Structures are given as C-alpha cells and as structure tokens.
Design a protein around this ligand. Sequence first.
Ligand SMILES: *[C@@H]1O[C@H](CO)[C@@H](O[C@@H]2O[C@H](CO)[C@@H](O)[C@H](O)[C@H]2NC(C)=O)[C@H](O)[C@H]1NC(C)=O
Lengths: 388, 387, 406, 409, 425
Amino acid sequence: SEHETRLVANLLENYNKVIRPVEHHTHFVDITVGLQLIQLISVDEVNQIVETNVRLRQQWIDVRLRWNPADYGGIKKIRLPSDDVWLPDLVLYNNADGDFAIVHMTKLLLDYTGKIMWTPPAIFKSYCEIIVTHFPFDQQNCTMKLGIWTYDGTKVSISPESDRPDLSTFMESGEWVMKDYRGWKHWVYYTCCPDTPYLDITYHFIMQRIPLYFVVNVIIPCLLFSFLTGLVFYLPTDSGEKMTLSISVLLSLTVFLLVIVELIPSTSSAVPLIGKYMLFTMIFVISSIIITVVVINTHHRSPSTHTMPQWVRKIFIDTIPNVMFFSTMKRPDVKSAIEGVKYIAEHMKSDEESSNAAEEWKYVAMVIDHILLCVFMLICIIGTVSVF
Amino acid sequence: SEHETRLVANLLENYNKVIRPVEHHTHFVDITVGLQLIQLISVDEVNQIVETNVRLRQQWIDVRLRWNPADYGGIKKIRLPSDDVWLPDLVLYNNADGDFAIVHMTKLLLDYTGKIMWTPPAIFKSYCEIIVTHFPFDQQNCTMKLGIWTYDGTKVSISPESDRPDLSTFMESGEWVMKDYRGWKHWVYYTCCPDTPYLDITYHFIMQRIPLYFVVNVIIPCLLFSFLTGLVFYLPTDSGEKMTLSISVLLSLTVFLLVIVELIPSTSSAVPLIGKYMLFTMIFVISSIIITVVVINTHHRSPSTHTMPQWVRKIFIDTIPNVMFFSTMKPDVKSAIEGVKYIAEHMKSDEESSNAAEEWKYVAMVIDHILLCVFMLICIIGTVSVF
Amino acid sequence: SVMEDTLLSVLFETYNPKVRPAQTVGDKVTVRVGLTLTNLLILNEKIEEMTTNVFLNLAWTDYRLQWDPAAYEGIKDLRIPSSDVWQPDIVLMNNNDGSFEITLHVNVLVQHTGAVSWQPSAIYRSSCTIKVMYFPFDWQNCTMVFKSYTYDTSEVTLQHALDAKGEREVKEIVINKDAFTENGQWSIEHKPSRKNWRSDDPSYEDVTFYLIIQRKPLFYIVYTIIPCILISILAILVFYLPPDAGEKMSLSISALLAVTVFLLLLADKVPETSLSVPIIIRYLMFIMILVAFSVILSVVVLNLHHRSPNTHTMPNWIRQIFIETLPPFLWIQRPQDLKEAVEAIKYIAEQLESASEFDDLKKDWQYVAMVADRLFLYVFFVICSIGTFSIFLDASHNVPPDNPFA
Amino acid sequence: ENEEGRLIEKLLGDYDKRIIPAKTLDHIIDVTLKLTLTNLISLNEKEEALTTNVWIEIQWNDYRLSWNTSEYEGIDLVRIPSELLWLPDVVLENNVDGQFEVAYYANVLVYNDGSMYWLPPAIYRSTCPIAVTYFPFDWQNCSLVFRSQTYNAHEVNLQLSAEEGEAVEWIHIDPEDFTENGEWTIRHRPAKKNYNWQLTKDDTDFQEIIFFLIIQRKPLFYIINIIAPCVLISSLVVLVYFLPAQAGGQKCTLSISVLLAQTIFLFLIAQKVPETSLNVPLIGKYLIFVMFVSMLIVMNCVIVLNVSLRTPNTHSLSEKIKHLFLGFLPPEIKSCVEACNFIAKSTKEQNDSGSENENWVLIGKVIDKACFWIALLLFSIGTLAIFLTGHFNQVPEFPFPGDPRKYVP
Amino acid sequence: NEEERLINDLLIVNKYNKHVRPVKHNNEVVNIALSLTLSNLISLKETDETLTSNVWMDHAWYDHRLTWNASEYSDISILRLPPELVWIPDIVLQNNNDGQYHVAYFCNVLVRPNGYVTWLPPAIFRSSCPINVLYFPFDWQNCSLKFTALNYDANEITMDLMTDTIDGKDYPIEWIIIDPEAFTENGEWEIIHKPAKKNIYPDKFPNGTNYQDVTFYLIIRRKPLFYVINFITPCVLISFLASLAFYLPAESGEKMSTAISVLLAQAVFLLLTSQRLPETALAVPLIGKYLMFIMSLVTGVIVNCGIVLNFHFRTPSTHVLSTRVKQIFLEKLPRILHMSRHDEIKSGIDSTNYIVKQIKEKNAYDEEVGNWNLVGQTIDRLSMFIITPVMVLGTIFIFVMGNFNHPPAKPFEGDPFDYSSDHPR
Ligand SMILES: *[C@@H]1O[C@H](CO)[C@@H](O[C@@H]2O[C@H](CO)[C@@H](O)[C@H](O)[C@H]2NC(C)=O)[C@H](O)[C@H]1NC(C)=O
C-alpha cells in the first residue's frame, strides 16, 4: 500500500523508541496488561516449575504515533513491528527456568489515535510452590507476577484488563482442572526506593489435579500389596511360605517407595501424606513380619525344652477361641522280646505326650495368628468405610 | 575518556576486519594460542563426550592498530570488542556436541604496539574416546584439537603459548584427577589441502578417575553377592534353601552386570575388566548352580531306582573323606506270627534302603564340601592377588 | 547478472516489507496455505507433542513486486531473500514449544506478475491431545493449526494451496514420496486440511492440517502383552500345584510382582493424563487383581490343606459342597509279664487306630483343599481367558473413522 | 513535550559505548555491586549446580551521562537501555553453563550527576562443589563469584554497595520478594571482595566479589522416605535368629531378601547424591554397613542351618562340643521271638538317632541365641552411631570461622 | 597489504550483490560441486533414530564477479572472504532431526583469481536414520544425509558431486571422503559402504526445489561384541538353568522357584533390550525374537514342572494310579529314555493282627506313593530330553542367523559399482 508506506515512513522518521510515550515527563504511561492463558504446558512438581503458554496483551497510547486517516487514504489501523516503537519492559518476577521478559517481538496493532495493541506470545516458566501434602489429590496455587522493571508507578502504570486472566481459548489440560484464576494489582514500597510506588500484577491459577492417573498407576498397586500384607496371617505355618509372602509384600512396597520419592519434590515444608501413608503401611508390614516370625517360633516350640506357661494356656487356649464365633476352630529269651514290646509301647506313649504338647503350641500359634488376621481385617473395614 | 574515544575512532576508521593483519600479503600473522582449563564439567562415558570450561588465550600483533601514546594522553592499552577487529578462526576439530569456534565474543586487550590479547571463554564439548578396559579404575586420554580453519600455515601460524595447558585456576573435579596434560603442535596435510600444511595444537589431558563412587556403588555389592556363592555350598540340602540362595546371588549379579552396562559406552573397542570379571563370576555362579542341582539330586537319590556305582563309592566314600583335614565329617494266631515276621522283615528292608539313602547323602555332602573348599581356595588366592 | 541487479534495485527502491501489500485501502491479501510433510518424526505422548518436518507452502500476491520481463532481459521470476519482501506472519499457533515461526527462511520466488510463493521448512512441535483410552491400539488425531499471527480476516484471506497444476485446491497435507520417511510406529490414515472460523470471533480464520495417525502396536504387544499373558498362564497354573509342594506362594507372588513390574515400567511410556485409563493399563491392572486373588485363594487353599482335627472341626456346609456336590462337576472325585505285654500291644494298636482316624479326617481336609483348588483353577482359567480376549477384542475394534470429519 | 527525548538525544549523541568512562588516564571506575536473592530455585546435586533467581545491583559513574537538571525541565533521572551504554562486564565466573551475563538486559537508571544504577534480573547456575559426607544431614557452601570479564583492577574497582555508610557484606533478601526453598534453609549469606594474589593487579581475575550461600538441607523428607524405611527394613535381619533352622523355616529367604531390599535402597540413594568420589554419603555408609551386616547374618544363617541339620551319618557330635554348647552358653515261637526282638532293637536305634539329631538342633538354637544378641547389638550401634553423626552435623556458627563477624543486616 | 585493495575492488567498487546468483545471464546455471568429509560418526541413537555426524561439507562453485588479474595486484593467488559478504549456495540437510539445516560454523570461503570459490565449513548434522532392528545386535544400518538446494530451483543452480583428478582425467567423488589424518573410528559402528549420489526426480520439474538433491549414504555394521558379551551370554546361561530345573527332585522344594527365577531374569533382559531400541513395528529384533521364544519355552518348563509336582504328590486317597499310566510312565518311557532301571490272649492276638494290617496297608500306600514319585521322575526326564534340545537348537539357530547377516557387499542392489574411494569410474 502506497498510503501505508508513506504513513509508516512519516510515523518513524523522527521517532525515538528509547523515550516514553508521554507528552510530558511528569505524565505516566497507562498500560492495560491482560494475561491470556492458552495452554498449561506442565507442572514440574519435583522442580516446582509451571510452564504456561500465554499471550501477554498490552495496550497503551503512543501519541507520537498518531495520524489523520483522511491524509492516508482513510487508513485507521496498521501493523508495525514491535521493535520499532517503545515497548514496556514488563518482566515476570518469579521466572525460574525461562525468559524474564517478552522475547517474541511480534507485530503490534496501531490505531490512528496512537492506541497500541501488542499481544506477544510467551512461555512463562514460573516458580510454583508445590504443596505436596494431599498428592495426588492436591490443588496447587501458583502465580505469575508481572511488573514494569525499571519504571515506578509515576512513570509507567500497569492495570489489568479484567479481574481475571483470559481463559476463553484455553486448552483443557487433561491433568489439571482450572478451579479459579484472578489477577491482583499490588502497590509495593521497596527499601531501595521508599518514596514512590512500584506496581505489579499477580495472576494466580488455582489448579486441581485429576487424580485418576496416579490413583491407578501408584495407589491401587500399593493398596493391593497392603491388603495382601495381612493375608500372611491366614497362611498356615506348616506351609513354610509365610516369609515368602510377607517379605515379597515388603519388597513390593519398598519398590513403590522408590517410585513415589521420584514423583514429588524433596521439600520438607510439608510431609506428603502419600509418603506418610507409605511409611505407615511399611511399619505395618514390618510389624506383620515380626509377629509372623513370633508365630512361626511359637508353632515350632519344642515341648522338650519349652513348657507352655499357664497364662498362655488360659488365654490362647481357653478364652479367646471361645470368642471367635465365625471361626471353625475347636474349643528264656522271651523276656527280652516282652521288654522290647514294653519299650516300644512306653516310648510311643512319651511320643504321644510330646506330640500333644507340640500340638498345643501349634494351636496357640494358630490362635495368635487368627487374632492378628481379625485385627487386620477390622483395620481394613474401618479404613474402607472411613474413606467413603 | 575523550582521548580514548578519539583513539578508537581513529583506529577503526579505515580498519577492515576482513583482511589479515599483515603488512605484506605474503607474511603470516603469528598467533600464540594458550588453553586455560577452568573446569572439567563432565565426562559422558556413554556418549564419549567431554565437556570442559576453558579460556582460549590468543595473542597476535595487528600492525594496523598501532598508535602513539603521547598523542592520546598517554593511553597505552584499550579494550576493544572482538567483533571490531580481525580475529583468527580457531576451530575445535573434534567438536562433538557444541560449537566449532568461539561464540563468546568478549572484549580484547590491545596495546599501543598493536599487540592483541584475546581470552574468550568457551564450553568445549569435544569427542573423547573412552577406554573402558580398567573401569572404574581407568584413566582417560582425550584431547582438544584446535587449529586455524581457513588459513594455512603460510597465512596464519599458531604456536602454543606453553608446552602444557594452564590449569592454575582449574577447579578440582571430584570425579577425576588431572594426572598429566600437554599441548602438541602438528603440521597436518589433508586430502582437501595436500599442497600446504594446516597447523593445529592438540591439547590432551590424562585424567584419572577417582574410583570411590563406583567402588562403593557397584564393586562392594558385587563382592558381597559373589561371596554369598560359597555359602550355598556350605548349606545343607535338607534346608531346602540352596536354590533360593544361589539363584538370588545369580539374579543380583545379573542386575549389577546390567547396571555396569548402563555406565559404559556400547563400543566394542575393548572389553572392560570389570565386565569381564563379572561375566566370569556369573559363569562360576551358574556352574555352582549346576553342581548344586547335581548335589541336590544326589542327596535325594532313591535307593530303589538308583544304585550307587562303584566308581562313586570308592571315590566319594573311601578316597576324599580322609583327605578333608579341617572338616569333622565321618488257627488265627498263625496269622499274627506271620504278621510279626513280616513286620520285622519290612523293618530290615527299610533299614537297608535307608542305609543306601544315607550313603547317597554322604556322597552329596562330600561333593559339596569339595566345592566349598574349592571356592574358599579361589577366594584366598584372589584376596592375596589383589593385595 | 547486472540486469537482475537493476531489476532488484528498481523493485526495492521504495518497497517497505513492513507494509502489507494492499493496492487500495481495504484490500485483503489472499494467502494460499499448504503443507508438505517430509517426516513425522515423533509423537511424544508423555508431553503430548507431535514433532514434524514440514514444508509450509505459502503463496500470495505483492502488487509492488511487478515488472515487465521484456524490459529486463526476459527475467520472468526472481529468488529473493525472504526477509526483503513482506510476508504474512503465518505461524503454527498450537506449537507445544514457543517456536511459532519457520526454521528455514528459504528464498521467496517472485514472479513478474507479483505472485510470491514461499516454501520454508520447519521442524515443528505442535501440541496434540492424546486419547489414551486405547493405547497402544490407538489412533491419534493431531492437528497443525496455521494462521497469520499478525493479520486478521480483514487484512489477509487464508486459502488452500494449489496443486502442481494451478487448477484446483489441495485440501490436504502433501506427501512427496521422493522425500518422505515413514515413521515406522505410526501410519498416516487421513491427512485432510480445512479452514476453520470462530462464530464468536469474525476476525479469526486459520488453516488446520489434521494428521489421523494409527499406532502400529507391535512393540507394545511383544514387550508387554505377551509377557503378561505368560504371567497370567502361571497365575492360572498355581491352582494346579499341590499344596504339599510348598511353592504355591512362590509362583503366585512371583506372578504378581512380575505383573506389577510390567505396570511400573509401562507407566513411563504412557501419557500422564487422567481422562481415561489406557486399554493396556486396564489389562495390566486386571491381571494384577486376578493374580492378587490367585494369591488370596492359594493362601485359602493352603490353609484348608493344613487343617487337622486337632485344630479345626469340619463344618457341615464345607463337607456338603466340597465332598459331594462339587467333585462330580469338576471330574475330581476320589504270668504278670504277659498281661503287661498284652497291655502294651493293646496300647500300640489303639494308638495306631487313633492315628488312622486322625489321618482320615486330615485327608478329608486335604481333599476339600484339592477340590476347592480345582474349582479355582477352572474359574480362574475362564475369567483370565475371556477377560483377556474381551479386552483385546475391544482394543482391536478401534480404527479411525473412514471420514476424517475435517 | 517529553523533554527526556531531547535530553537522551543529547546524552547518547556522540557517546561511544566501547569506551570505559574514565575521565583521565589514572581514573579507576568504582563498580559497586549488590546481590538480591529472590529465590533459591534448586541445588542440583548430580550436576553440582546451584540455580538462583537474583537481582544484581550494579552501580558505577559515567561522567559522560551527566547534565544540568535546570536545562531539561528538572529531569534528574532517565532510563536508557543497557545495550546503548557502557557496562562493566560483570559476570558470574563460576557458572556451570556458558551463561556469564544477566538474563534480561533491563534499562539503566541514569542520574543527572552521572550516577548509573542497573538492577537486571538473572537466573544464575553456579558451580557448588557438594560435600556429600553427611547427606542428607549436610549443609552446603555455595558461592556466586562475580568479576569483570573485561576490565582489570587498574581500570575497574569492584566493591560491595553501602547504604548509610556501612558496606552491605551479605546477600540481600528482600521480604517483599523472596520464597523459602523448602529443602534448603539459608543459614549464612556473606559477601566479600576477594583477591587472587597469584595474579597481578592486571589480568581481570585479580579482584572479584564472592557471594556465599551456606544452606542447610531440611532432612525430614529424606528421613521419612528413605532412612526410616531403610532402618526398618534393615532391622528385619535379626528376625532370622527366631526362625526354625530347618526346611520351611525360610531363614536364608528372609535374610537374603533383606539384603536385596538394602541393595534396592542403595540404588535409590544413587539417584539422590552426586557421582563425586571424594566422600561416601552418610546414608551411603550406613547402607554399606547394613549390607555387610546382612551378608554376615546370611553367613550366620547358613552356618546355623548346617549345624542344626547335622546327622550321625555326616558329623559326629563331639562330647566336648556338647559340653561347650550345652553346659556353658545356655520253631514258630522262636522265630516270632527273634522277630519281636529285632523290631524292638531297630526301633531303639532309630530313636537314639533321632535323639542325637535333636541335640544338634539344640546346639543350633544356642548359636542362634548368641548370634542374635551380637547381631542386634552390632546393627543397633551402627545405626545409632551413623545417624547420630548425621544429627550432630552442625552449620558453623560464623560464616567464616576466622572472622568474628556475623555478616548479617 | 594489497588484499585490502583487492577486496575493496571486488566488493565495493564493483557493487558486488551478495543476493544475486553468480551468472552473467539469468538463464545460465550455477554449478555447485558438493562433497562430504566424515571426521567422526559421533553417534547413532537407535531409540531416537538419529545419526549425529561431524562432517566437513565441501562446496565449490564459480563466481565470475570474484575474478581478478593476479598480476595487476601483487601476485595474489588466493583470498579468504567471509561467507556473509559473498554469494554462497544454501545447501541444506533436508532430513535433519533438529532445526539445524545449515552448517554450524560459517568459515571463510577461498577465492582464486579465476573466480573459483571453495567453502569447507564444519558441521554437526543430526539426520533421521530409520533403524532396522530386525537383526539387532547383529545389524547394519543404512543412514543417508540428503542435501537439497531450496534457495534456487534446478534451472538456476545444479548440485553435483565434486570431481577429482588423478592422471589428467576427472572423476566424480562418488563417496563420503574419509581422511585418515582426521577420521576417528567409532568403537561401535564400522563403516562398510559410504556412497554419494546426485539424485534427480523426473516426476518433478526443474522449476521447483525438489527436483534434485545430493545424498550421502552411510552403511554401517554394528560391532556386536559388547551386546554379545553383556546381553546375549547372560541370557543364554540363565536360560539353560531352566532346562537344569528338570533335574531337581520334586522333594527338593525348589523346582518351581528355579524355573520362575529363570523366567523373571529373561523378562528383565527383555525389558532392558526393549529400552535400547526404537518403538517401531517394522520387525521384532533378533534378540527380541530369541527372548520371546525362550520365555515361552521357560513358561512351558514352568507348566511342566507344575505337572511333575502335581503327579509326584498324588496319593491313593485322592487319585488312582491307572494301569495305562503305570504301563507308560513306569515300564515303557523309562526304558526308551534309558532311565536307571485267656480273655487276655485273644485280645492281644487281635491287637497284633490289627497292628499288622495297619502297617501292611501303610506299606501299600507308601508303595503307591513311590510309584507316583517315579511317574513324576519319568515325566520330568522326558520333558528334559524334549525341551533342552529345543532350547539349545533354537538358541543356536537364532544366533547363527544373526551372524549370517552382512551388508550386501554393494550398495544400490541394481548398481555394480562399488562406490569405493580406490576405484572411481
Ligand atoms: C514450471 O514448469 C512446469 C513444466 O514446464 C510448469 O507446468 C505447467 O504449468 C502450467 C500452469 O498450470 C500448465 O498449463 C502446463 O500444462 C504445465 N506443463 C506441464 C508440462 O505440466 C509449471 O507451471 C512451471 N512453474 C513455474 C512456477 O514456472
């Protein structure tokens, strides 16, 4: 366009982009800053960084860039490279892993009135204080603090377009639900500069994690192995496999601990309830292993060296078994030949006595083990009902 | 300064940074190249790339940038941007994952005689041929081949500043020890360029790995799990845990061999001694499992179907056991009468069958004691050898 | 040539590449937009991004770039650096990274009529929403949204590119067989192109290129599904092991741990989205739960097998179910010294008889364990077989629609 | 009319940004330097890099950029992009990446007297050689070394800033903009000018400003998620001495599985600590110790199983062994008659053999008791000693042991 | 220094236009000679199907504008100019993986007084190399670097292979140049063939930029000693332990544990092999095929061990040892498999007769249990003899078919030329 060619030649012939667009150095540039969230790329929980794809909509008047449309064929809008005009040095204060300012110098829209509309894209990688305490059912509240870097409120004033960021073209995350989002303007009075106000807009996004992925992939297997933890108590000692089951459960749980510690930040500001419950279930498995070892030891007590204490006999054989109603427990040379038969009979009698004592020890082991089974299943019932 | 501003305006007025700094085009600009190693950032063994933080000290005389100090308020030195003057194109030939030339175009020092000092920083990610033979006790020799790219020796000559790189400011690694380092200048004739020699200076660093991380994290666990191999030999068959122990040892050893595999490049230039030793140890553990299966089968030989051959009897019962010095091994009543007789006969037969079964068990015990002593002897000779 | 120099000097004497070519105020610049795919490099499902190597075929008309060929030695067209002419800010809007623009700024081809064509190359990374429901037997619908970042419909009019013969529009991605490498993991089923508007925004117009790609799941089959089928075979087999072997726990628990390890290492290759559970993960969790119930019932069978009259009394219902009704269905039906000596013999005999009765009852318990174990064998075989078949049939019945709908 | 336009066109006109603003030949530019830490983003252990979000205040005087405020409508402060001005090339030398310069080249605040004030933000990744000796109870001593990349001490004088006449000898932590890391607590944050006396007043490396960050790990996460599980699982080995020493006791099963779990924990630690070989981490030393103790307990289990399952066939139960281990530490009629006699005799010998087997089992049980007590003591003392050493790892009271000063605002 | 005057005359005085093809007339064609020197094959990441190469990409064209009379100036036979001042052909690697189309370092061009411009910049190229995992780790790959000229169509510039002169006749350099003084051998990949071709696509027109490219192929054979030593050998041995599992007696109590452990080790090897290859569907690698076969065979071994255990623990009280089973597993198979082989006194009499009867029926029960034990032993011996040969022969066949896999001794099947540096045509 010849009209627009001449217009662009005239607008920038003696235009200095180092200077603020004010008619007097006492006036301030009023910038209407509006953040538009396009995509929530990532929430790096371990590194506590939130990547967002945003458009940083900025509007201000540059009276140096006014014209009369009648003198340019009625042209009322032009697109002008942002590198040619004065731009606000708007910085993301809480940058953690990206750029502090806008780097994609996209073209800006300029009205004949000097009104500029600049909506450059950005990938804000901002620091996000991740609260891993209800993981994976947690909601994160982390923000993007935007402000003019080298100008105070008396030179450049930034105001939000609206009380909330723009999520009209926001792509659904698939991992997070955007519950709330608001933009707050703040006047700060730093120590450097205690006379004048410094302005910044903090856009925060209240994000709710969708827990299906982590539920299925981490919590369900740990729940299965935790449930199998107490199944060792229904395993008879004679099988010779209680250690196999309990120790395999423990090995699986330590593997899941290895999996979990790499899913969350190593911060100690808050104890992750997932980690606390892993520790609790691992203490439970360790106690189960200790008690099953005690039960195995009791089951194999030799009556020769061990005599059942009277209190053990009264507790585990006389009272508790009568409590479990749903259990099916109970509650010439011929002289030498004659003497040999006598020895056979008496030795088999002593063997029967020893076998009865050993069977009593085994019954005590079974009763202890069944008590532990019932305790574990009661824990399971109260837990499952509680979550409801 | 007004004087320095005027000086810089004068020097760079007619200056063409495209031309070499030589009075006559047949001369060559001599460049003194020194490499200062600030830090050995990384040694990527798997990828065979060594990342280092260096300063590429370069010195040369630019006759066009001379001035008289008396004419400029006594100014004898100035700092000029590298991009303002002619610079040599030093290219790291063995670049692997970075920049071939310098990209940090820092300000250079210029004397009033035209003597330029330019020491730009650089992160050299150079290719490093890794020798895995003595991992993790290996020392690595890999270099940085620096040379002028487009100018042959008749136009731009580089000479090392010193015989060795400068490690005076080298930050200690914590993974490697700089055993030795030196720099060699070469006149190389290329197929591209057979008529004239191209000059380069190949700095090389002999760096010794500090073998404590890998010792603690690989070798000690490997030694523990390999030492658990003789226990299965001392472990009686009646325990029903020989396979458990031996197989657990085998699986852990396989895991650690694979972990080592993840730490070294997949190159076949040589076989790591640690990998070779652990493969041999896996072969030994597998042979021990084979012999343990044979021992377990022997222990359970039913005497009904298996009769001990004489070559087994004479050898394992009568020959080795005495050699084991340190071990402490070795009407209607007629029916009742016939029934008692039958009971006695069957008890006698059971005694004989037992005696045969215990003969088999003794054979198994002596076999596994022989294996235990073999393993113990191997352990003693190994510990003596490593000492 | 010198004539090219003169032509370039006259063309760009007052030409401002900042200014969109609109001969009269209000005119719109028409921009052919087409896409040539040279390589679908990656579809990184973990970060939901598709990496493609494409040529972006753009054509517009710059009335300012016109000349008479006869006045310039018959020069009918020029190759001009792309930065020297005005270009429409055509970008990939849904790029996953921050790279909106092309990578390679190839020369524009300017013909004497002002027809500017531009075929820059770019390694683009577009955000593709992954439907995990049927992974790895899934077909993804990845789109590359192209439009002018700067100019709206009032300034440029996006159109489809033209085919080699400038006769009809090409409403699809162009794939040049001479320069195109198949992914080997994805097969391109549909590659349509379409212009999209927004009823809530009359100033919005884009050209979207859709890539309906179907995963070839051989890798996942071989490396996850077959091993898990073998592990499920073992989980079934545990119910054929006799309880006396003392190895039912070993087998069942090893199967459970193996399936869990497979799930854990597969978690690394599946997307982290939570809108659905992939068919593979659902299958692995099915097998995990089935093997866990295998462990539970093996513990139950071991418990039954090791009961004795000294510890448990056999209830009537267990006897009824597992001794008579079930076994048929499972085909698993089964002188003072002489007085002292005579007293010793009597004691030995009655002790042997007592042992015989105790052994008969213990054998009844063992038989109940055997019958229950056989019942579980059949039930678990049926459940595993038909559940696996149903899941994989459901996966198999997942193909992209014949009409791409775009 | 914006008078700043005319003022800046006067200032930058005929202004050369390659020229150090030295008024005379002997003038040295004082480059004041202050660091404001707004966020300690991370201390990457594996790559030994500290990432910080810092505002670095750099102040110098450029006599060329001075004017008479009365001549420009009272303007005393302008903002000029730092790309148009001379800057002291102040860089972070100990950077892991090649990022010497600041992240964002903010404007420079220029005052009418020539005073220049530059407060650019930066994401610096600086080398922090990590001492693992007491991990996870460790405190690290990270350093941000700043110096001119271009100018030596004969022409630039790096110094720490000073408000109200007192030098700011610490990293500034502004409450209005600072986030607690959650894994690392800042205990000391001194700053000091350092000299390299191996270099001369030239060489551009003679002088430097070093900002130190002595940070202490918060170990609750590591305790709860690694050390507590590790100690609990490692305490399971002692349980093997209460399992029967016979088939079905699963003694070696339990001990070997605990050893495997400890190996898994070694692999876990491998991903949390650097690959440096100067020291073994405290948790690493504990894992090595408990793996060795578990191997000893596996040996002990094998020996006990060997002893308990001894038979008269294989081994002769010596009387002295019994004394030591159980005394200190704890024709029809004739044919029927011979048949009966043989039955009784055989039964008697079988029962005696069983008795000697039982006696070997008793010896094994005694060895289990003694070895349990030894192993429990060994494991308990090792755990207590190592993790008490971790507990008693203290951050030094002063930022520099020699200096009596605290280096705090 | 008359380089100053010469470069001034060539560039400023003559109004040299960097953006115009070096042709006198528009219809002329610039001939760009192109060769590739490989200095280091940095890596071939199979997972990302990327070839990283350290190459020197040699360009040679004629620029009539950069001609000068060497005598008019102090004799200057050569001149170095930055490529940002002269016209260079933008030859781009079309099949790159990252966004690096051009070369890394834009070094000076060399210009002779006849206008012959040579440009030899170094580059790190990351090109797309589709991976054939079929015979991994005994595989050879066929990586190509396809270079196109997208800045000018084929009517304007013609890509060609650089030619070389040996004894007066010029022959095209139809291969990647490898300089012994500047080539680093890859410890994992051996270069077998390295041809270079100038491809023309007749279905396209010279009007376009897709009509003609220069492609440098690189057929490289993997050196498998690493994978054989560290992957195949452990897997094979651990597999043979599965066959060993048949020799354990059923009363050992560790038959199933042994077989299962072998299966888990094989699964671990399968997963670690899975992590080392791309997730394509063109083929199951040779090692993957072997692992699938051996895992299926070991699962069969586990099932057969379960069957042997089921048979061993049968008793007369739960199962009847059928005469068919006896005849097969105790008489016939054993031999084929060559397997080894006064109120008092009557009461007392009644008690002893009852004791005898009980002991006698106990002996019969034990005899039948022993028969079941022998049946189990027969089954496991049969299964050993039937599965160890299958395991061994499958292993040998699979890992011999791997070693009998070599590149075809000539690239371009239909071409008899060797494309060898020592025999140009
Ligand atoms: C480049 O050359 C080809 C072949 O000469 C041109 O193809 C012609 O295109 C016109 C325009 O549609 C058709 O009418 C002719 O039938 C085509 N010829 C053939 C042989 O197919 C092509 O148009 C040319 N393109 C440019 C940009 O010059």
